[PDB]
Coordinates of C-alpha atoms and ligand atoms in Angstrom, one line a residue:
X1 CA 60.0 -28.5 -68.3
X2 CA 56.6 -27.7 -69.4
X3 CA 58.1 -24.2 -69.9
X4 CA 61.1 -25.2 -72.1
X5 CA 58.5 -26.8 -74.3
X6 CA 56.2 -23.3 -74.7
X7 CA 59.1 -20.9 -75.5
X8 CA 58.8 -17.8 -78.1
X9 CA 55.4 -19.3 -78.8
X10 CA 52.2 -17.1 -79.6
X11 CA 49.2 -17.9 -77.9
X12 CA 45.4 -18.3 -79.1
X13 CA 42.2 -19.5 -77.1
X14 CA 39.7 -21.6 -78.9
X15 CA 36.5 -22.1 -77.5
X16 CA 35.7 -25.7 -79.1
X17 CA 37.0 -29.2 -78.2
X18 CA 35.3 -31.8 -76.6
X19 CA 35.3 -31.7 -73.0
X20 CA 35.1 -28.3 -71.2
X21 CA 39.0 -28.3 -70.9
X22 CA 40.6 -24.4 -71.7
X23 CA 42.3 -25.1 -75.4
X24 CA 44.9 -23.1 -76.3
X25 CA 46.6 -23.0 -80.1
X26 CA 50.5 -22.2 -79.9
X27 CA 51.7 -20.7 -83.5
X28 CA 54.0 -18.8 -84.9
X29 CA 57.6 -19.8 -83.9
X30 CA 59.7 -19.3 -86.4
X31 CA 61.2 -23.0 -87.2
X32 CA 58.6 -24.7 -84.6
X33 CA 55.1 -26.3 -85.3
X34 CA 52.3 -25.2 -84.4
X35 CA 51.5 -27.0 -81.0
X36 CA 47.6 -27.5 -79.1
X37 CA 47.7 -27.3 -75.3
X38 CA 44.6 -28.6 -73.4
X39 CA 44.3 -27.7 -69.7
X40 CA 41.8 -29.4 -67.3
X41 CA 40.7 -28.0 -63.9
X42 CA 38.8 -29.9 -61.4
X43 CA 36.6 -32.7 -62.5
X44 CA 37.8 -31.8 -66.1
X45 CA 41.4 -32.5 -65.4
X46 CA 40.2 -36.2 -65.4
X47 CA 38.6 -35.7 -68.8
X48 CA 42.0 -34.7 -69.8
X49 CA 44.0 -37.5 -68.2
X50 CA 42.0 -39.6 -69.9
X51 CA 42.2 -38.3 -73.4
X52 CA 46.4 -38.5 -72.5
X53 CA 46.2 -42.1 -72.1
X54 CA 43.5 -42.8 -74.4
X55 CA 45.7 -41.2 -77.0
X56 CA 48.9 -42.8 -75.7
X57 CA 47.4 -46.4 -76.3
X58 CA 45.6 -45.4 -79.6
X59 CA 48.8 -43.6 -81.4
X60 CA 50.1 -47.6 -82.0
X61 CA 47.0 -48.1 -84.1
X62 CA 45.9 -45.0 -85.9
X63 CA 47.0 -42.0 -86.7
X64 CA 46.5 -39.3 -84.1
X65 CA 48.2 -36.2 -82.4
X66 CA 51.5 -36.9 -80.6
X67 CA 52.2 -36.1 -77.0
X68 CA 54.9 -33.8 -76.0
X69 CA 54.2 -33.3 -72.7
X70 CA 51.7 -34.0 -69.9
X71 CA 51.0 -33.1 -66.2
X72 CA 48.8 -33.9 -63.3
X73 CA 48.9 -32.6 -59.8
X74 CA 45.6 -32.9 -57.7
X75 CA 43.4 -30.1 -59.2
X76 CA 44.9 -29.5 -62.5
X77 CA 45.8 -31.5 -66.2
X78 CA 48.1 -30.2 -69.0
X79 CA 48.2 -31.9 -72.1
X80 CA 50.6 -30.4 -74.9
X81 CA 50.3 -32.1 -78.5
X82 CA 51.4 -31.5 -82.0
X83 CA 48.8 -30.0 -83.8
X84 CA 47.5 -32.4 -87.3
X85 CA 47.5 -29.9 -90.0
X86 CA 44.4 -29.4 -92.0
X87 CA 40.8 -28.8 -91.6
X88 CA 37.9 -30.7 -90.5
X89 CA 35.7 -32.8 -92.5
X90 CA 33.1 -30.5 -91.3
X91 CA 35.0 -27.5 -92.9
X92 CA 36.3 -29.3 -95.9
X93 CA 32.1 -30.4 -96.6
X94 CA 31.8 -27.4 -96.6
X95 CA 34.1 -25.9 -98.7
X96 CA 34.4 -29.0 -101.5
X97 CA 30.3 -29.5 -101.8
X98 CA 30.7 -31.8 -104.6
X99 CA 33.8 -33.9 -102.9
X100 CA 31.1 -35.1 -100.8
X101 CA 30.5 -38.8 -101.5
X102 CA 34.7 -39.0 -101.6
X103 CA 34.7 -37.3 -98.2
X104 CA 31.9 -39.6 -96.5
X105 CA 33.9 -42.9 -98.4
X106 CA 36.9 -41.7 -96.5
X107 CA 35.5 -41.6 -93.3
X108 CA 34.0 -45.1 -93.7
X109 CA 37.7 -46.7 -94.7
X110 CA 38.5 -44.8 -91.7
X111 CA 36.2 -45.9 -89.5
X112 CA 36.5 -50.0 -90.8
X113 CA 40.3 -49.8 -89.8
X114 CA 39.7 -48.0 -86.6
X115 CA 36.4 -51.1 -85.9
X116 CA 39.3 -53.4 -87.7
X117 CA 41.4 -53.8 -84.1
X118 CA 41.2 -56.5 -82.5
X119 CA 39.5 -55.8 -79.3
X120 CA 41.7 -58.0 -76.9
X121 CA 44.5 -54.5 -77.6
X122 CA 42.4 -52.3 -76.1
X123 CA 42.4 -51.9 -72.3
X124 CA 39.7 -49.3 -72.2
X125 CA 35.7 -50.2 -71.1
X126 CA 33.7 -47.6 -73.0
X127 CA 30.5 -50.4 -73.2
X128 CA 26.6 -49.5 -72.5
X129 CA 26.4 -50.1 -69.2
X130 CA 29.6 -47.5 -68.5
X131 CA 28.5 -44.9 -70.7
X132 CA 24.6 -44.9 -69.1
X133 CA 26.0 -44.3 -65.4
X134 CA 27.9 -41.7 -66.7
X135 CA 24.5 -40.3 -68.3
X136 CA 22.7 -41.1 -65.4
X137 CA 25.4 -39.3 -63.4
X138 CA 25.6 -35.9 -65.8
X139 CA 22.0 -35.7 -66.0
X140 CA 21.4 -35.9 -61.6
X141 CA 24.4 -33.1 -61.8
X142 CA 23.1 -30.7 -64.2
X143 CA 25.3 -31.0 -66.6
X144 CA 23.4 -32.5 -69.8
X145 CA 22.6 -29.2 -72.0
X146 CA 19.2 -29.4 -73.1
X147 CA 18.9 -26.9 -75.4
X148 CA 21.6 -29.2 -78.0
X149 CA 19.2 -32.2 -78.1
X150 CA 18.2 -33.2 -82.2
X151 CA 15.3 -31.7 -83.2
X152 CA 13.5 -35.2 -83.0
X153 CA 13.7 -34.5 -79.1
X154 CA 13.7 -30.3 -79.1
X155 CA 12.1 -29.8 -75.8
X156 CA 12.3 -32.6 -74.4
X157 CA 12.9 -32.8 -70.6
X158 CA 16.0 -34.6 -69.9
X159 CA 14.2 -37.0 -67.7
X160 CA 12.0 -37.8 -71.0
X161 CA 15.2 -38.2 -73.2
X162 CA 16.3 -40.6 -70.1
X163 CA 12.9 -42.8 -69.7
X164 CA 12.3 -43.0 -73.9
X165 CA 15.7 -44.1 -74.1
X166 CA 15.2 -47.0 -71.9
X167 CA 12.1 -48.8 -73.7
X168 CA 14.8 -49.7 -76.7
X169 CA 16.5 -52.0 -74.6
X170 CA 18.7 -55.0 -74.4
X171 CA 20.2 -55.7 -77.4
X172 CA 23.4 -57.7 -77.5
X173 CA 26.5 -55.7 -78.4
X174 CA 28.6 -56.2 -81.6
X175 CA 32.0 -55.1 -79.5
X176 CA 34.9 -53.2 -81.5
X177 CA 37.4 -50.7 -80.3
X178 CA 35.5 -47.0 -80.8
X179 CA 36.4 -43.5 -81.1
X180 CA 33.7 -42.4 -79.3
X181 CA 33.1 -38.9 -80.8
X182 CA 33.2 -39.3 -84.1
X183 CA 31.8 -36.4 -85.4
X184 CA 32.8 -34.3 -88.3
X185 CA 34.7 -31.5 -86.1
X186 CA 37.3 -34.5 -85.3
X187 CA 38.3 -36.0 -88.4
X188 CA 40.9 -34.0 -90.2
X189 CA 41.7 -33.7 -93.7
X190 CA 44.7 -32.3 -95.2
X191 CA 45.6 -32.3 -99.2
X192 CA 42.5 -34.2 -99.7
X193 CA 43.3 -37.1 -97.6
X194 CA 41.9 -37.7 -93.7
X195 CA 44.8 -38.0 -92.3
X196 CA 44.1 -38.2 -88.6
X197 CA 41.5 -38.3 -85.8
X198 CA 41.3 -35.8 -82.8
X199 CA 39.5 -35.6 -79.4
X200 CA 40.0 -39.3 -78.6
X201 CA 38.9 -39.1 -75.0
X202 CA 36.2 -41.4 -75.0
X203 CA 38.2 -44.6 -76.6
X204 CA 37.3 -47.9 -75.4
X205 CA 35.5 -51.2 -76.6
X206 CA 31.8 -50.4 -77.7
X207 CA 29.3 -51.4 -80.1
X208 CA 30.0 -50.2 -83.3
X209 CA 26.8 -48.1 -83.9
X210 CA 28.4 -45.6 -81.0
X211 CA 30.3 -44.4 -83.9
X212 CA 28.4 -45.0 -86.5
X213 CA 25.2 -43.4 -84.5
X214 CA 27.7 -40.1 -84.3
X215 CA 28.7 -39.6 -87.8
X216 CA 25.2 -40.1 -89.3
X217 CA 23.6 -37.8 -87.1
X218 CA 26.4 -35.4 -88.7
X219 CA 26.2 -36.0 -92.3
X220 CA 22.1 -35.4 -91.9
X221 CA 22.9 -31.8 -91.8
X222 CA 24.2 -31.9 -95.7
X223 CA 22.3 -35.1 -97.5
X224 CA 19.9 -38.4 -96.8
X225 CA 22.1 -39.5 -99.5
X226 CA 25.5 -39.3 -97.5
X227 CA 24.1 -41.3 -94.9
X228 CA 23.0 -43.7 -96.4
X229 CA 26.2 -44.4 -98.1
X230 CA 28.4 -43.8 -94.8
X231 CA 26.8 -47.4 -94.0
X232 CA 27.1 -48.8 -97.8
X233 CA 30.5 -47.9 -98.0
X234 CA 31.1 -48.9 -94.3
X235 CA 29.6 -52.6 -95.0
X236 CA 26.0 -52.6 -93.4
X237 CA 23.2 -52.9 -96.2
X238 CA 20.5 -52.9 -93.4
X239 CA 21.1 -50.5 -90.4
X240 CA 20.0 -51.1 -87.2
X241 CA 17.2 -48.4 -86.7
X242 CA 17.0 -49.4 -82.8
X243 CA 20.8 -49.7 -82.1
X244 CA 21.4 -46.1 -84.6
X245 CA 18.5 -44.6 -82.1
X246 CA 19.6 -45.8 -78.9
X247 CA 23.0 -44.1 -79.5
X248 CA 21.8 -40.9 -80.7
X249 CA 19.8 -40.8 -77.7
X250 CA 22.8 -41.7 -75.2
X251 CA 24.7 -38.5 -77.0
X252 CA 22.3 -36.4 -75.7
X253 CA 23.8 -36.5 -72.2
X254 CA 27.5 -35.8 -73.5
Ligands
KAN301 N1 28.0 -31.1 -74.9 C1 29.4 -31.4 -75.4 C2 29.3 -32.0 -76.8 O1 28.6 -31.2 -77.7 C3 28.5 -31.7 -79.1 O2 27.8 -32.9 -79.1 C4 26.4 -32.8 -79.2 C5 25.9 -32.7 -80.7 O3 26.6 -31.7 -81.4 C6 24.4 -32.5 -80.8 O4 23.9 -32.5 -82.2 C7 23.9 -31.2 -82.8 O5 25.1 -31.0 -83.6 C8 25.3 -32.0 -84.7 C9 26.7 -31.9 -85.4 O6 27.7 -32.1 -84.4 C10 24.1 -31.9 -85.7 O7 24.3 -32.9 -86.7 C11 22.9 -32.3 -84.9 N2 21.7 -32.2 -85.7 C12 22.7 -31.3 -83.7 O8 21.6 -31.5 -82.9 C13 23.7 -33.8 -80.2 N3 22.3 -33.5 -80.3 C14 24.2 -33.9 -78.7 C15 25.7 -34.1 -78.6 N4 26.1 -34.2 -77.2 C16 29.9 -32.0 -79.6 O9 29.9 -32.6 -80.9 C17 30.7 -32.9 -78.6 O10 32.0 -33.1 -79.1 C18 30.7 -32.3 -77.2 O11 31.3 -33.1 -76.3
0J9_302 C1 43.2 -29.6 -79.4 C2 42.0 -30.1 -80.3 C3 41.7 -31.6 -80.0 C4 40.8 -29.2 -79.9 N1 42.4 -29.9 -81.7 N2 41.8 -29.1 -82.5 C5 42.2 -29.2 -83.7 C6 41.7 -28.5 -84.7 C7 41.8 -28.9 -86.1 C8 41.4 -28.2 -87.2 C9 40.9 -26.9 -87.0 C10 40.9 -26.4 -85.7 C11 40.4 -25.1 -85.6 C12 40.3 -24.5 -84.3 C13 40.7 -25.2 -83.2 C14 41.2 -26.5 -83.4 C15 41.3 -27.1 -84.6 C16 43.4 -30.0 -83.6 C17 44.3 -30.4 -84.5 N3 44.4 -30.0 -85.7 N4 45.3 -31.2 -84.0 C18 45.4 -31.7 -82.7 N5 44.4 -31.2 -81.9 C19 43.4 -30.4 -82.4
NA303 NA1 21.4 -27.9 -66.1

């Protein structure tokens, strides 16, 4: 029982997380930890369902939330987790302003084991062609907020984002398992180590740069310097300018 699960638990709301699912942070139980309960309704119970499995798959690789318990019926998605304990490397930037270059060589050792799977364990598509009909889709719906774009494209019409976007392609892909989100709010540090990723969703075989793209974009809120050294310490002496682009853009929609 999902109910046997929740018992003599307090209950928070936290509006963050990456889909629009209802988070809810369950605390203090005496002799319990703290737990993190997503709940999808309608089309978002099928962004939940697919962070359930996403993380189901991952947990064999990399070190992630674990699932306690999970439920779908037709309209709705509950997914109950343990909760990783520590902060964000977001909040820990922030907090530690001179433990940056550590923090940003972290996330790189990070990122190289998590672009370090093989690709032939990973069952998810997550690949170009995917993520633009899912673009394509959100922006016909309504759904892209525009007012969130990088200040490279602040008031730009969505359709504009969508057309410039376009005149960077083909390239061929360099494929490797990706997080999809990598972001600063979902990497989590604890005692000074990163000791987990959160919000795994959007897993599945992409070109590297989807994470990379991601990260940078981040870290040029604090330094030039950082990102720079995200791809030294990563591997890449020369980064792709039109591959980095193309996936900044493609954010835009999510
Ligand atoms: N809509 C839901 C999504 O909203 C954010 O994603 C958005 C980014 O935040 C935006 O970028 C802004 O925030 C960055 C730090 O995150 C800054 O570095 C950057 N200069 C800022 O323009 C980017 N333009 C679009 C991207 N879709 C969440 O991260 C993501 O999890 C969530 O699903
Ligand atoms: C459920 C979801 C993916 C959104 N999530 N969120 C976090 C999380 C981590 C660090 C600080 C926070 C502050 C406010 C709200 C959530 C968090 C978190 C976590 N630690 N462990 C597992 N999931 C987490
Ligand atoms: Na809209």
């Amino acid at each position: 029982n999902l109910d046997a699960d929740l018992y003599g638990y307090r209950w928070a709301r936290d509006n963050v997380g990456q889909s629009g699912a209802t988070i809810y942070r369950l605390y203090g139980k005496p002799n319990a930890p703290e737990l993190f309960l997503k709940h999808g309704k309608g089309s978002v119970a099928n962004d939940v369902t697919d962070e359930m499995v996403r993380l189901n798959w991952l947990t064999a690789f990399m070190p992630l939330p674990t699932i306690k318990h999970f439920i779908r019926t037709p309209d709705d998605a509950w997914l109950l987790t343990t909760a990783i304990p520590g902060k964000t490397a977001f909040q820990v930037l922030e907090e530690y302003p001179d433990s940056g270059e550590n923090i940003v060589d972290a996330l790189a050792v990070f990122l190289r084991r998590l672009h370090s799977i093989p690709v032939c364990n990973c069952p998810f598509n997550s690949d170009r062609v995917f993520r633009l009909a899912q673009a394509q889709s959100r922006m016909n719906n309504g759904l892209v907020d525009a007012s969130d774009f990088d200040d490279e494209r602040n008031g730009w019409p969505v359709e504009q984002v969508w057309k410039e976007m376009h005149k960077l392609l083909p390239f061929s892909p360099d494929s490797v398992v990706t997080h999809g989100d990598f972001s600063l709010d979902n990497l989590i540090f604890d005692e000074g180590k990163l000791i987990g990723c959160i919000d795994v969703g959007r897993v599945g075989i992409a070109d590297r740069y989807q994470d990379l793209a991601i990260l940078w974009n981040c870290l040029g809120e604090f330094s030039p310097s950082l990102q720079k050294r995200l791809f030294q310490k990563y591997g890449i002496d020369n980064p792709d300018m039109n591959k980095l682009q193309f996936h900044l853009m493609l954010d835009e929609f999510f």
